[PDB]
């Protein structure tokens, strides 16, 4: 199938390295079971806190092996803010502009792993980008996530320790069933 999928991982100080690693584990589980390929599913990975880091761009080779190795090598960046709005803005202003021609009509999906309320202003993405917020732990701002996600309901997960257990299947069921 043809999809553009963005994973957005919060990697602030409030998340911490241990929990960030669990976010990476979650994401690896998803990507491993996705039909990733140059003509099929494309994946981008962002990490964000104060700034946004592009960990794997849409415009590099869309090979599962390459992406997974890069994912394993991602280093927790830390940061004193959770600039979720900035991460979303990057997707609309950069990431989802990569697909061109026929592929421009493919669905755009965003899977975002956050555990804290946004530090900045959140603006809604264009209608052609579907966002599924994954709020992890008790400090996720449910109302904010519901606002970003609409019409998609956010997936609210107990904590980061449990995130890699079942949440990958919830994600795969929404994207790729
Ligand atoms: C999160 O993952 C990173 C990298 O995957 C871990 O960093 C490793 O830490 C061990 C500690 O025994 C070192 O021996 C390695 O050199 C590190 N590897 C890399 C690639 O940096 C880190 O320990 C993990 N952190 C937590 C809190 O689980
Ligand atoms: C917050 O992070 C920014 C960017 O790294 C930095 O300039 C600033 O000094 C930090 N402030 C505090 C109080 O840690």
- Nearest in space to 109 (alpha carbons), one of 1, 5, 12, 16: 5
Ligand nearest to the CA of 82: 2
Structurally, the chain folds into a number of domains equal to 1
Residues 6+ apart with CB under 8 A from 165: none
Structural domain boundaries enclosing 12: 1-177
Measured in whole angstroms, how far is the alpha carbon of residue 169 from the centre of its chain? 15
Q: Which of 9, 11, 16, 17 to mutate to test ligand 1, by most ligand atoms within 8 A of the CB atom?
A: 17
Sheet holding 155-157, edge to edge: 52-56, 41-48, 3-10, 108-114, 129-136, 155-157
What is the stated resolution of the deposited model, in angstroms? 1.9
CA of 81 to the centre of ligand 2 (A): 8
Longest CA pairwise span in the chain (Å): 42
> Cβ < 6 Å from ligand 1: which residues?
17-18, 21
Q: Which of 9, 13, 16, 21 to mutate to test ligand 1, by most ligand atoms within 8 A of the CB atom?
A: 21
- Would you state the structure tokens that stand for residue 87, as one six-digit string? 């991460």
**Separation between Cα atoms, residue 159 and residue 83, nearest integer Å:** 20
**Separation between Cα atoms, residue 141 and residue 154, nearest integer Å:** 11
Say yes or no: CB of residue 80 within 6 Å of ligand 2.
Answer: yes
Atom of ligand 1 nearest to the CA of 72: 5
Say yes or no: CB of residue 119 within 6 Å of ligand 2.
Answer: no
CATH of the domain at 93: 3.40.50.410
Residues 6+ apart with CB under 8 A from 112: 7, 8, 9, 10, 84, 87, 131, 132, 133, 134, 148
Q: Give the residue carrying structure tokens 């003509």.
A: 39
- Residues forming beta bridges with residue 42, ordered by sequence position: 4
Structural contact between residues 108 and 128, judged by C-beta atoms closer than 8 angstroms = yes
Structural contact between residues 70 and 89, judged by C-beta atoms closer than 8 angstroms = no
CA of 80 to the centre of ligand 2 (A): 6
């Amino acid at each position: 199938m043809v999809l553009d999928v963005a994973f957005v991982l919060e990697g602030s100080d409030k998340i911490g390295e241990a929990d960030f690693n669990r976010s990476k584990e979650f994401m690896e589980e998803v990507i491993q079971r996705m039909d990733v390929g140059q003509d099929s599913i494309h994946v981008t990975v962002l990490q964000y806190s104060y700034m946004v880091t592009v960990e794997y761009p849409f415009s590099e080779a869309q090979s599962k092996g390459d992406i997974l190795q890069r994912v394993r090598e991602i280093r927790y960046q830390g940061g004193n803010r959770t600039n979720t709005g900035l991460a979303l803005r990057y997707l609309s202003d950069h990431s989802f502009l990569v697909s061109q021609g026929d592929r421009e009509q493919a669905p755009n999906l965003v899977y975002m792993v956050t555990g804290n309320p946004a530090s900045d202003e959140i603006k809604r993405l264009p209608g052609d980008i579907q966002v599924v917020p994954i709020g992890v732990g008790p400090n996720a701002n449910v109302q904010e996530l519901e606002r970003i996600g609409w019409p998609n309901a956010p997936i609210l997960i107990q904590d980061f320790e449990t995130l890699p257990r079942e949440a990958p299947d919830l994600v795969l069921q929404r994207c790729c069933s």
